[PDB]
Design a protein around this ligand. Structure first.
Ligand code: NAP
Ligand code: NAP
Ligand code: AWU
Ligand code: AWU
Lengths: 287, 287
């Protein structure tokens, strides 16, 4: 089939593009900006893709390798443009043309259920955002809600803290290896090497709706650094800091949660729990 | 004949003014119980009430400690900004469209800068023009809401008002406000006299007119010209101090939109709408 990819030069979009091409699919990198709704509709009307995917957003930039970038005066316009408006333009136009859209969103719109409390099973697909501590998370929360108005037309995948075996400035493990102090908190995370094939399968199948799109279960920064130490780097040591210490040195807070992945597990029962998956990733990693 | 109207923002300055007028015209007005951002509660209320027409007079434009849009520039208020100035209005657009019920959305023309210099080649920002003013968090979000309303061009009436004026003094009224300000940044602007423009808005909603409309009285008026007309007609001892654009920017949390709106589209439908200077004369004579 023919796959039109927005964000195909980005970290994730490049990775997905490569896998679609190894699978024998035709990939078209979108030339239109997602927020240029008239150019998007011209491109979609002309290319006539079988599938559209969105790997776009504004999550770092000059001076800031993190979502702290969006807290600067003058960046709200880039935040809403790339992290809400562009994705909504793709939803409206893909829906009009009856072309399945995969939107790669975020689960960094919730806070909590990550304390191993016996009565808490994690945030669901239907749950409203309850984390408002970064401008990124605020805007993405509304994008996530708005995507529920396209439940039969758009696949809304909530990834978090994405990890690759290959080291990359964007990869959660690369980042935490680089940080002087670690705020260790159990969290739902996405191993892209494991879950990109699932995402492609879902888009091939025209599956629609919202899915929490993390590996089952919780892992902490300390558990990940402990595996790197215990598998490869016996000398490895790090300093811990609290949520409050971290808040003081960043421009924004950070989302910490468990996502309930029962919905994804109903379709894809072989996705590894996050600790089995991280053990696998760390075992294969170069430094 | 007389109809049933569901009003979001029925207790607000503009909403309560429109409610009273629809009631004076012998309509049935229901004040909405649901928050516009509570999409499930909105869908319940619309499906229950089965209104002939829905109207939105909602937004977040002031709050504790800040009688202006400067309120939205505080850390932690982006969530209120997007919730009330974008997401709630989009919830109303999606749901009213689903139920094929006409929606009037009271938007803003404070999404553009320029064309107010009396240059003969500049006839003002049109309905199709994209936002070009990004100097307040209010204007940035409202600009995206305006663009999003264009995806509902057959189902929603999107009216861009600016600097609303009432005969009746009120803290929200542009004339009350500039009378209250020690220093005036005098700039020619498109402005909306609500006493003259609300009856046009109600007619449009009765006719189920949809699309975007610039919704200011035709032409420009400056702060200095309004205050001069108040002095000469009502208050001969009135005096004020003038200040620059950059001097204003030094005292406020954000910049302000200054523009001309092209009102040819409205004037084509309603040739009798008073030009701003004729209308300001009517207003000041009634004060
Ligand atoms: C998911 O989905 C997104 C992909 O992330 P990532 O980590 O792969 O980030 P990334 O490496 O920054 O990739 C993002 C891509 O999206 C593009 N983009 C941003 N806004 C766009 C718009 N309005 N129109 C078209 N392209 C746009 C960027 O291209 P430009 O550099 O050309 O802006 C970039 O190629 C993130 O939010 C991620 O978590
Ligand atoms: O159009 C708007 C009207 O302007 P105005 O000058 O009349 O301002 P206003 O006097 O501040 O009126 C705004 C009204 O909208 C309501 N509102 C705000 N967000 C809402 C939401 N998410 N759901 C339901 N109601 C909401 C407010 O009610 P609350 O006070 O109950 O928030 C208020 O009654 C531009 O602000
Ligand atoms: C596109 C979005 O990117 C996001 O990354 P974010 O910009 O929050 O990454 P970091 O600030 O590096 O934060 C990554 C992690 O590092 C922790 N940390 C940070 C700095 C420090 O000095 N020490 C620490 O321990 C921080 O608490 C967080 O757990 C998320 O992936 C989100 O899932 C995804 O949708
Ligand atoms: C809901 C939105 O409200 C808005 O009002 P805004 O909050 O910008 O009002 P003010 O800050 O009082 O500003 C009102 C006017 O006062 C001027 N001024 C301000 C302070 C000062 O000390 N001296 C001055 O001369 C300012 O430049 C502006 O022209 C707009 O109506 C917009 O059309 C509407 O959609």
């Amino acid at each position: 089939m023919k796959w039109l990819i927005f964000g195909n030069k980005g970290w994730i979009g490049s990775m997905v593009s490569k896998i679609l091409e190894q699978q024998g699919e035709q990939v078209v990198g979108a030339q239109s900006r997602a927020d240029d709704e008239s150019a998007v509709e011209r491109e979609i009307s002309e290319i006539k893709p079988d599938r559209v995917m969105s790997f776009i957003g504004r999550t770092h930039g000059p001076g800031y390798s993190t979502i702290d970038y969006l807290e600067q005066s003058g960046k709200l316009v880039e935040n809403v443009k790339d992290n809400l408006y562009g994705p909504l333009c793709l939803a409206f136009i893909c829906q009009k043309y009856n072309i399945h859209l995969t939107y790669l969103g975020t689960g960094c719109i919730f806070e909590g259920q990550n304390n191993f409390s016996a009565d808490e099973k994690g945030f669901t697909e239907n749950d409203k955002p309850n984390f408002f501590g970064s401008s990124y998370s605020v805007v993405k929360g509304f994008t996530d809600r708005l995507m529920h108005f396209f439940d039969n037309d758009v696949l809304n995948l909530r990834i978090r803290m994405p990890i690759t075996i290959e080291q990359n400035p964007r990869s959660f493990i690369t980042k935490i290896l680089s940080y002087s102090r670690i705020c260790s908190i159990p969290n739902s995370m996405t191993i892209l090497d494991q879950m990109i094939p699932v995402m492609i399968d879902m888009a091939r199948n025209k599956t629609t709706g919202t899915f929490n799109f993390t590996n089952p279960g919780l892992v902490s920064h300390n558990e990940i650094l402990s595996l790197i130490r215990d598998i490869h780097k016996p000398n490895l040591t790090w300093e811990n800091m609290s949520r409050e210490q971290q808040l003081a040195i960043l421009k924004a807070d950070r989302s910490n949660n468990l996502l309930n992945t029962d919905k994804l597990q109903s379709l894809y029962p072989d996705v590894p729990d996050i600790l089995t998956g991280i053990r696998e990733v760390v075992s294969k990693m170069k430094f």
